[PDB]
Scaffold this active site. Structure first.
Site, mmCIF file in Angstrom:
data_model
loop_
_atom_site.group_PDB
_atom_site.id
_atom_site.type_symbol
_atom_site.label_atom_id
_atom_site.label_comp_id
_atom_site.label_asym_id
_atom_site.label_seq_id
_atom_site.Cartn_x
_atom_site.Cartn_y
_atom_site.Cartn_z
ATOM 1 N N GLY A 1 52.413 6.539 22.831
ATOM 2 C CA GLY A 1 51.599 7.192 21.810
ATOM 3 C C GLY A 1 50.307 7.808 22.340
ATOM 4 N N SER B 1 55.660 4.890 28.583
ATOM 5 C CA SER B 1 54.347 5.531 28.613
ATOM 6 C C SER B 1 53.305 4.459 28.287
ATOM 7 C CB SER B 1 54.422 6.735 27.679
ATOM 8 O OG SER B 1 53.148 7.126 27.208
ATOM 9 N N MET B 2 52.403 4.672 27.315
ATOM 10 C CA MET B 2 51.335 3.706 27.060
ATOM 11 C C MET B 2 51.875 2.312 26.770
ATOM 12 S SD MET B 2 48.918 5.440 27.770
ATOM 13 C CE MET B 2 47.791 4.040 27.654
ATOM 14 N N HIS C 1 56.651 6.998 33.328
ATOM 15 C CA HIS C 1 56.561 8.435 33.112
ATOM 16 C C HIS C 1 55.876 8.727 31.782
ATOM 17 C CE1 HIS C 1 57.661 12.628 33.394
ATOM 18 N NE2 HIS C 1 58.358 12.570 32.277
ATOM 19 N N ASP D 1 61.007 11.709 35.707
ATOM 20 C CA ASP D 1 61.362 11.433 34.315
ATOM 21 C C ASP D 1 62.602 10.554 34.309
ATOM 22 O OD1 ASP D 1 62.025 11.340 31.658
ATOM 23 O OD2 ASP D 1 62.222 13.516 31.413
#
Ligand SMILES: Cc1ccccc1CN1CCn2c1nc(=O)c1c2CCN(Cc2ccccc2)C1
Ligand SMILES: Cc1ccccc1CN1CCn2c1nc(=O)c1c2CCN(Cc2ccccc2)C1
Ligand SMILES: Cc1ccccc1CN1CCn2c1nc(=O)c1c2CCN(Cc2ccccc2)C1
Ligand SMILES: Cc1ccccc1CN1CCn2c1nc(=O)c1c2CCN(Cc2ccccc2)C1
Ligand SMILES: Cc1ccccc1CN1CCn2c1nc(=O)c1c2CCN(Cc2ccccc2)C1
Ligand SMILES: Cc1ccccc1CN1CCn2c1nc(=O)c1c2CCN(Cc2ccccc2)C1
Ligand SMILES: Cc1ccccc1CN1CCn2c1nc(=O)c1c2CCN(Cc2ccccc2)C1
Ligand SMILES: Cc1ccccc1CN1CCn2c1nc(=O)c1c2CCN(Cc2ccccc2)C1
Ligand SMILES: Cc1ccccc1CN1CCn2c1nc(=O)c1c2CCN(Cc2ccccc2)C1
Ligand SMILES: Cc1ccccc1CN1CCn2c1nc(=O)c1c2CCN(Cc2ccccc2)C1
Lengths: 176, 173, 171, 171, 171, 171, 172, 170, 166, 172
Positions: free
Chosen positions: E58, E87-88, E112, E150
């Site tokens: 997010g 991610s986060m 990633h 990715d």
């Protein structure tokens, strides 16, 4: 958000709190859901007491004619004195209800705007409804049917003093 | 919003007094609430009257038929009250009150006309069901009911009384 | 705007009297709620009858079949009650009430016509045929020919066909 | 409009009976709720069985796998129950019930076909489902993989022969 | 509907010191997670906190607000990845107390990164390199090179990389 | 679109054997490009055709349709990248006639790529083969490189074998 | 749409060279345009071949069958060419080209799987597809139905081994 | 669009070697402008080309496509700012032939600029270098100036090296 | 988009009239304008009516039907793809012996889902028109229109909806 | 899309050259404007030659329908009116306003005189003008027009002929 207050004998939303003191609000457009809520309150206040006055606060731009006629008929039906009060405005059906308070008991605050014009089913039925309004206004303002019909043609508002002169209300008050 | 009184939102308060509100358009969800309260009221007492308040433009035929059949099923006297309007199925339920207990307030408007996925033949079957229900309760002949229902017009409470849709047009207690 | 009585919402109150409501279209969340109520009622008494009020135009087939299977699974007698209409899966559930305990009000309308790959749709459709055949006692060919016609049945005609047992007017 | 029973909403009532509903699509918010319920239920007894009701067309694969992993994590026996349907990840969770405790009602449909990431990541997830299905059905990877290509549904009995469920319950 | 046990289930898990980070991270999630962390610390500054993560990531600044709160509180924080942590979300997983970072077997982990100027975007990205380097003990060249690709990591790969400590099947 | 003397200016470029591939590639772009290529070959199967590419990519199968048409006709095809050629855009750029793939100095080129899973992977493997063929690099190198979410400058794209010439002015 | 000289739109220009494009989803108005062009091209010559370029994910079944019936109807040999893809109804038109004149380019993808009418009608339509596929591919009805159940594509070369097309063409 | 007597007014301006870059720059605008620039070179590689710029900017890669095309063709290109040249619009203005970059007296010029991080930075540094080349300011000053959310008057832009003349009358 | 040779006007020059798609008032007035122009070119040589329609507005259909009856030219109808509801009424409505279907078409006389009485009046117009052109009885037409199902072209031939399955 | 024909002409403009005016949709100010422009134009070409007015309309805006009506009454030409499909509400008024003896319907048309931001008074005024217009052209009394227009129902072509809305019903 509707504020909550406490009464001394639980918490009431402020509107329910005003109904406890026999105030019934008719703010906003009149539609079938407003009429059924107002009728339910009027019938309920008559049952609590058929003598004690009922206050009807009106700040409305009008709305559904049949919905307003249901409220009006219910006003005529109960036995209580009904004091009507105009704050802000009483336009179209709203002024019909204002004019329908008990004689000597129809009030406006000093800056309210009153309109009996009806701003712009089969044609014959619209005209029948409209004639029903003429008859109701004639009865409660004491104006002529021909005066009511001509006046209703005019796209304009009345000051409280003019509505008083017209017969829509009895008193324009400033303080208690 | 709905005010609370004495405990009770005010509609439930009127329900405690044997009043059942049929306001607005009749659809299936309105039907199951009305039927629910009608049945619950009959179980509180099958003798005490029940008051049906009607201010309605009509709605779904089958949902209205479902309230009709429930009215006919319960034994309680049912006083019907027309306030504002009773059009299409609304007026059928008004006419379906217990004989002599069908009322209108003085300025209401009553319409038996039906303002305009099933086959053509089933739309007719439903219509004939309504013709027969109206004739049963208005004591009018089918000829008059079918003829009258073609006309896109409202009746006043007094014309409605004269037709057999209701019994009393009252002003005051 | 759901009223309160005594202090239940009227629907919960009816559930306490063992009435389960199937009004409106049948979807997965209707089925979940209907199934929840049937199981809970059986847990209350496995013999006390259960009343199922049906006023439905139909809905999702597998959600209908989930309700149907839960009815056949519980032990209670189930009295089905058609008010308004029972169409598509609505009429399947009505037909599935305990034999002799399947009712309609006088003015209800009943429809057994039905207004994923091809093979799977026919598979579901044949599941329907079979359930109807079982409960109406009609032959598969009759059921199949009947379901092709886009028409409703009167309650008395539905009684004739074997979808319901009684068409009552009063208690 | 969720009924209350006596005081409880009916889903909470069922959760009190160690029933957990997995109805409708599976997403992160469904997996969160399911996981929290499985975990709480284990906290109340790690020995008492847990009933997972499944009526699901599938949904997000990572959300499905989160539920799967939680099932495999808690010690409780888990009886799975297919009502209506269990497709894509729904059928994975069904097959994932404690051996001998996987059921279907008679009219359910079961599908293991699966009707923002790179091509290799999509294959890598697909391959996790092969492994998980092979583990729980005792079929070989080539069979799992070959069957999952077929856009079709299984009857409860076929699903049982395949190793997805153990019991087809009528009542 | 969220089921009740006097408690909604999530509040029930909070009473047992579980904090759910189970969707996309935004300011609203960050505000709620921070409030819960500060509160658990006030109940006891020594009792471990369990942080459940199933998130696609997010808003960076919102993720960084949670990160800073995790570091600020004295408590042990056990991070648990179910489903995914991308991610986060994988930043928060890696920020659990050393030795107390877990993943269930089928989760997937992504470092990633699938209005502000270019320079500011780059400053936030460098802050992410620094934080990952601290908690994974990988060099900045390794973090940066890896985040360009990715792709997802398995729980095992993520353990080898320094993102988590234990991959566990059962308790 | 302006008129030049009379033609709309793209039709005017078409008479000079210039075909524009600007914007996302979809089936209607592919049909239009294919129609122009086939027409130009029929005007002359020897004169060069200029393909102007400024594209972020698009539908893979539509991109392969243009590719196959390019490989099909006998004309030399000069590809020109202005702005960017990403995903399928850079595939078409690489598929120019050897010696005749060009870019302007400030273009950006990306070979990264921002149905069932087996099918997405079959397409990807096809992109691997095509890029290896036309860059003249090993397939292992293409496959590893395409995982990296980044652009190349024209000089880098040249070193990699995606194009032959970076030109400033008509040399 | 660009204009070309000896002067009109590139797609009409291709029509004059007896090429008919089936380049998107198939629906009633696409079926209508295609049939119009086919019937027109037969009027200009009943023997010269007609080129049908197919790049299509499929579409409405009855619309696809309208095009099919028009293909069997006209007297001209019809060369089908797959560029990009030919899925569901697209591959049926591909496979319905004149025997020996069904081609694909090398990187095309071909799919025969089929990703308000009653169940019975949907099945009847499905069986019509089996009969047509069985016809033109020479495979058994049992094999065609097994194949259509699989959500997958075929390379041009396996579409040839299957009987959907005749040649996988690289260059002319 | 009125027809005059090359008959619609825009096409008529194209016949007189005027190329309009009004409105936001996107890939379709870049494609039209590039096509006209190439067409005008084919008519003559010596006759000046006039580029009218009234733009808030737009897609960066589309703007660099027009820039590379301007640098590719051999014609003198006179650039003319009316209204505003913001972001990519001022890059194109600054890219006209030295000596032939103009503004009208009331135009506003902005070099501020209202995928992965690393790639965004890469694009930004391409802008820095293009501005440094054509304005002859240092990269240090350019990058500092591009941080400031402000417009420049035509005279300030001339003194910055974005253009050479502030034109009032012909 | 429409090729130039436009391909529709071209087919009109050869007396082909397209009724493809849903039938509404706009479609009806185009088809009628083309039938009347075609009769005006010659009241003798035939007109072909191409029909792939799922049906449409009943009064739009009847307007087309009445114009088909009105003009004197023979009318070959052809069913490509499907002719459902009003579409199959226009199919059966072509000149006897001049009504055709291609081999895989689908034909439906069922009507898939104003006052109730006006609905039934229209429905009875359809019973009558179908009875006329198929030489079936009103009873069989009505029982047939109740079933939600399609007919193969061969059935539509047996039924009297068309003459030749080319 | 509107076919073209050679007489060049979209098929509506072609019909107009033969003095056919279409009124085959909902009637609003825009339709009225077109119809009036054509009627005035056809009169200028010849104020004796009859004009054919095709009607397939559910009605529309009253004042727009009255503007067409007044134009019909203003032009000296004979106006044959033809009803295909349906003429309802204002559409039936225009049908009945054709030249005596030249009002036609096709056998299966449906005709309705029922009327499926202004004041109650003004709506009555409009309805009164329709009573008057219908009374004049059907020859019925105002009472009969009024009570018949209250019924939500369609007339057959023969009913409408005997009611005086049209003069002839014809098959071919
Ligand atoms: C209403 C109430 C609420 C709380 C406690 C006691 C009561 C007294 N009841 C009980 C039933 N009933 C009562 N009063 C009333 O006026 C009325 C009724 C029933 C019917 N009816 C007709 C009516 C009149 C005008 C508008 C619409 C309907 C009026
Ligand atoms: C309903 C109720 C609520 C609170 C307390 C007691 C009760 C009494 N019960 C229990 C069950 N039952 C009761 N009454 C009733 O009238 C009915 C039932 C059951 C079924 N049935 C059929 C029916 C009739 C007409 C419309 C639809 C359905 C009527
Ligand atoms: C349900 C309930 C609710 C409140 C209190 C007690 C209970 C009794 N329990 C507890 C668990 N359980 C109960 N009854 C039941 O019938 C069933 C279960 C569990 C599973 N199962 C299979 C099934 C059958 C058909 C539809 C779907 C699932 C039926
Ligand atoms: C959960 C609970 C609720 C009410 C009362 C007591 C408890 C008992 N606790 C307390 C903490 N904790 C408990 N149980 C559990 O299973 C787990 C925890 C903490 C962490 N953890 C890892 C995990 C596993 C799989 C999915 C996700 C996370 C499982
Ligand atoms: C929070 C709380 C909740 C229920 C009962 C008691 C308490 C104790 N208090 C009271 C105030 N306060 C407490 N704890 C805390 O950690 C903090 C505060 C205040 C400020 N502050 C800085 C901070 C750090 C990192 C994220 C954001 C803010 C932390
Ligand atoms: C096309 C054209 C246009 C204006 C004037 C003359 C021509 C010459 N024709 C006529 C037909 N035809 C021509 N050329 C061609 O290359 C091709 C054809 C037909 C088929 N076919 C296979 C193919 C190859 C690759 C992509 C798709 C299809 C290529
Ligand atoms: C088509 C054409 C276009 C321009 C010039 C001349 C022609 C030749 N004509 C004139 C009329 N006609 C022609 N050819 C044809 O094949 C056909 C017709 C008429 C009807 N009919 C049946 C049919 C078959 C299958 C699908 C649909 C309809 C085929
Ligand atoms: C364009 C034109 C139009 C009408 C008449 C004659 C011509 C002259 N041609 C024909 C082909 N060609 C011409 N000029 C040109 O500059 C260029 C080409 C082809 C390619 N190419 C590279 C390029 C440069 C920068 C931006 C993008 C592409 C420039
Ligand atoms: C149509 C035409 C077009 C171009 C050139 C000459 C013509 C010949 N004209 C001129 C006027 N007219 C002609 N033919 C016709 O059949 C008809 C007319 C006028 C009216 N009318 C009644 C009608 C029948 C059925 C549907 C609706 C209306 C038929
Ligand atoms: C109209 C026309 C078109 C092409 C060629 C010659 C003409 C003849 N002109 C010229 C001006 N004019 C003509 N005729 C006419 O009837 C009328 C006029 C002008 C005004 N006017 C009043 C009117 C009547 C009824 C509806 C509204 C307005 C009728």
């Amino acid at each position: 958000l509707i504020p909550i207050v406490v009464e001394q004998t639980r918490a009431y939303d402020i509107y329910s709190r005003l109904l406890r003191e026999r105030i019934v609000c008719v703010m906003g457009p009149i539609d079938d859901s407003v009429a059924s809520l107002v009728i339910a309150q009027l019938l309920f206040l008559q049952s609590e007491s058929n003598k004690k006055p009922i206050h009807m606060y009106i700040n409305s731009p009008g709305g559904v004619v049949t919905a307003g006629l249901a409220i009006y008929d219910t006003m005529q039906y109960i036995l209580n004195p009904i004091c009507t009060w105009c704050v802000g405005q009483a336009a179209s059906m709203g002024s019909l209800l204002l004019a329908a308070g008990t004689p000597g008991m129809r009030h406006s605050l000093p800056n309210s705007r009153i309109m009996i014009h009806q701003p712009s089913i089969q044609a014959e039925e619209i005209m029948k409804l409209k004639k029903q309004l003429y008859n109701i206004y004639a009865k409660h303002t004491k104006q002529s049917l021909q005066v009511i019909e001509s006046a209703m043609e005019r796209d304009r508002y009345m000051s409280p003093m003019e509505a008083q002169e017209f017969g829509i209300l009895d008193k324009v008050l400033v303080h208690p």
